[PDB]
Amino acid sequence: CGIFAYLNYHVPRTRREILETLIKGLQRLEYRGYDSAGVGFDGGNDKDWEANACKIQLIKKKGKVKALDEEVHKQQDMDLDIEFDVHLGIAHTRWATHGEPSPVNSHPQRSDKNNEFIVIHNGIITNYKDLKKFLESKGYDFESETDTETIAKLVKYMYDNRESQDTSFTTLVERVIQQLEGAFALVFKSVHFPGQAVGTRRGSPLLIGVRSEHKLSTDHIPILYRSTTCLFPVEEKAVEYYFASDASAVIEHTNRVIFLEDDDVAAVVDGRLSIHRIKHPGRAVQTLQMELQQIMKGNFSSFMQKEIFEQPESVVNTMRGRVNFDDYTVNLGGLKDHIKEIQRCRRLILIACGTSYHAGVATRQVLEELTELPVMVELASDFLDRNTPVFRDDVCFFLSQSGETADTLMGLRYCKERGALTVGITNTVGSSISRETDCGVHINAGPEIGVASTKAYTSQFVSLVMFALMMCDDRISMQERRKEIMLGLKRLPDLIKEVLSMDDEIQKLATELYHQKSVLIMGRGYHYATCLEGALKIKEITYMHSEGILAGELKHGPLALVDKLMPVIMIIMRDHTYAKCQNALQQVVARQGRPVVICDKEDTKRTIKVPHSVDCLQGILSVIPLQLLAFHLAVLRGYDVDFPRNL
Amino acid sequence: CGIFAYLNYHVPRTRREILETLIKGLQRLEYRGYDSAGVGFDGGNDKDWEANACKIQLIKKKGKVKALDEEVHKQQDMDLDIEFDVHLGIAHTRWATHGEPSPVNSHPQRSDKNNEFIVIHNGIITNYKDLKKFLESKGYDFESETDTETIAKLVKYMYDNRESQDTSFTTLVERVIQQLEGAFALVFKSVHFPGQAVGTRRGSPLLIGVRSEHKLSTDHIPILYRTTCLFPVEEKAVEYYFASDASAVIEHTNRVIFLEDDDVAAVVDGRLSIHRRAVQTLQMELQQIMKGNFSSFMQKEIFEQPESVVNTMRGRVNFDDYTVNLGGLKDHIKEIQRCRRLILIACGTSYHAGVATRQVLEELTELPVMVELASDFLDRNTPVFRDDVCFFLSQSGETADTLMGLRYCKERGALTVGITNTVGSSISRETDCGVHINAGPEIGVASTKAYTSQFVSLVMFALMMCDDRISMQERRKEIMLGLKRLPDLIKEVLSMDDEIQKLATELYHQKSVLIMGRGYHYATCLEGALKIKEITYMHSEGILAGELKHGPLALVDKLMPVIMIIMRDHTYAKCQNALQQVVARQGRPVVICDKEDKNTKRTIKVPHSVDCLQGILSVIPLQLLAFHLAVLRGYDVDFPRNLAKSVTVE
């Protein structure tokens, strides 16, 4: 789950400082549920650090990182005051899967009883059964039940069979990954290559942060196959490197990062960073706009609560630099090039999973309205199962907060093979979907740390609307509609705040459903997505059977569930479907239903009155009371909203 | 909502023979609405039946028809022994979608406290509020909250301001429909016009049955405009049967006159005339609307799927040469292949039929296939083009949203195809072409054979669209042999009825059940979930298997009942992963799988078939499960609560 390594090269740090840095990185990567963490570093208490680089020491522990930190400072014969001019430390937090949680099964995994090679690993090796046999036949005995130990044992096998006494650490890892199958991100450390690090990935994210008070030789590292050919400080040697599986563990130290790509072998040798391959392409040193405050709870007791209540801000962040209300223009920079190509295409296909799919349903109508193109919205897993027909004049959008969901990513590659124009709507710089799409939009909602999608849904929503507004900016007959929608976006942050000020009314509703085992959420049109997304939130966070029902489908069967006992929530807004929803309401009440109504500004039982906005934006306001409802219900029932129950 | 009126002209019927005929005609229509019922006949206890036509009697009550039949009998005022040589009685069962199903809101409505004009209405008047404020000013008091009372209070307003002392009943009705907006199918009765019935329609079904041992004067009633009427030649004996459906008339005769929009039929002096036709024979046997030896229509229709599947393929599938021919589409297939997209539009189970066949349609046509819920399709003003081919799946052929979607697509120049189970329905008439699935009448409220016959019908279309591809010949043979073997496999599934019933005894007490599937069985878990909702009232929900890991799986614990559909097709490995996830969450799921397929100790093994046909076999256990659960919970499978069959209005 979480990888972190800290390499100080001619930046003196005490053993304490190094360990504090490693512990701190794991906390950035530590999400609720992890149950195994460890650190690897140079042992020995020789005042001169150059003699302690032949004893790798491991401290691994089951439980939360807090427990690891206590074990660190709780070491008998370990002096934390030794200063290292050069040192590499690696760290890992995990959610034990393959084996049972235990100190042995925690990372790093070692190559022998003297820790000649150690590795931290994110992912799974498919052929790990076969590899363990090949090494055992060569005498290597295993101590863990994890697939990671095979990696540590295999790199020593390559070392034990090297042709020359100076075969590079890179060459060894190159030979290792060539024998691995599956997905992995790896960081290696060895006594035979003191101060050096090797990081490589295949289908699992791995990035490198860099920091130095000196000028760096380049901002675009060229690839070396098997002058400024590598990255290094120019004035002096001092530099710091940060390997990590997520930017959250690097951003507090530096915002200059390199995102590795599949089969890259990045190595730090003599403090200089190079990137090797076997196959002028290069890897860019880029600046992240992320900042530490964005991954902290602040004054909120949970990340779910923070991300719900900060949606006024995240919606604004989504629009910053992209909307101009002075002259009613929208400019998504990532699409200003392909914008005219897109309009020459004949169909829009939105492909996503879960809540990201709900964002497509939530904006499908306005996309049809403003683009006038057919809009198909697909669940990624079903899209793949059916081998859906795709053509060269299709424009395919891929909605993904993480930018890594397997089905959404495989759908992307499916559509690229067939020649379709691909567009990524993501919330994670460097992610796979953001790279492999022809173009894309970063929704810029800030990191989503909570288990459930809250601000990501609303920012995706706003992003797709902004795209719809770009697609009709040349239509005279639509100028008024664009103006109306855009003045809605202008007012939206304050309308969200207005909804959040009704939190007390949502708590009251939560206590009325406290003991209920089901609830039906009914909507149609613009609020079909709203009732589907609310039902998912209440399933995922509250663990009760909430179900979204298309209002127009009631009389076709589902209405049989309505009686005096079945809780019902109906979304009834003042748009063109208003009279129809009034009909559905009369149908529910006719069958002894006592429903709660989320209705528009100044429209049977309790009513949650949200403010009135443009019809194609109401979904953003109407889903928030459902977000809060799931939150408050879970809190009432003693659940930790930040502790996932999916796994 | 059902309509039924009995007009016996010069055929002596006692007051019990007519009342037992009105109720008998409502039971034939009860599945269209069973929230209330009523009847309208002549009162008075005078031997000379001529001195009784001036006294109307209304008997309306809340509940099914069996609640009305008991209200009609055991009365202390109605003498059921008066011989009527000429009499007219109107009846009606109501689907109270709004308000209470009270007797005051049921039909026949009335125009005053003396009942001068009573009307039975099927449909909605889109301007009854405007008609209610006009009549309230002229001196008319309203009692019910329905829109039908504005039709009764209005036919009397045209009678209170006529021009001649003897204006025909047609004239009065013709003036009413001119002030009525929306759809309606009416059958009037007045004391001023004894024995005369008027039957007009507009966007709603309405036919007139005729029985007479004497020769009928003609077989093509000429539509008139404000040697003309249908009647027996020599004698006067004739019995008419107004009704909004053919099942309530077939029992008495198979000679009906299907009216058209704005045709103002009228029976005067026992002569049927149309104002502003073709007397034809019905092609339906009474056995087709009889439960037989089954205790419910739903059970019969499930166990008869081996037959209805055969009927859907009869005369259309030849297994010796592997050819498929649907007459309704023999010519259009040429132009359909030149089109660029298929759109399937339907509601409920009919929508599931499209989900169930979407993949194979994409496979064999190579065209994009979009499946749309009719109500949402209309809400979004979905883009449609001239080179779209739009299919409309409707068992009844009258579902409002599906029908409006049709007219939407026709307005945009699309090619429209109807997949119905009702000849003469609106959807079958107004589409460019179509197919009659020919599954027989479906009486149970929950669709069973209609689903599997639609499924089979869409596959047959797919087989036609690829009959000229060399590369797909083997695939076509694989599918068609699957169809050949399908009836017997359905019998093999049905033989597990008892095993399904035992499972039901383990679930009837639960509040919720999750049904999971993917690929070809996404539709299966959606349709099964809908059925369990509809007749059992359990909170059953279908969950796409591939979406479990994205949130819903958090709802699974050792207590949540789970049904999974794991079949030996290309999603088997994926479905095995979903099964592992469910168990990891402590779920103890029931698995529907193939015979040749573990932790699962609660399995339902269906026979293995072609992947794109397996949905037919996998859904049947869920049909049976829903049936058995509803029995265990003391519910009626034929008359589920809060709804009826065929949604023909808003």
Ligand SMILES: O=C[C@H](O)[C@@H](O)[C@H](O)[C@H](O)COP(=O)(O)O
């Ligand atoms: O609360 C819902 C979850 O956030 C989940 O449904 C999520 O939306 C999907 O797993 C797709 O995630 P991505 O947006 O990263 O693809």
Ligand SMILES: O=C[C@H](O)[C@@H](O)[C@H](O)[C@H](O)COP(=O)(O)O
């Ligand atoms: O059990 C389900 C019901 O039968 C219902 O969902 C029905 O399928 C729809 O009302 C479609 O009706 P039509 O097929 O007659 O259009």
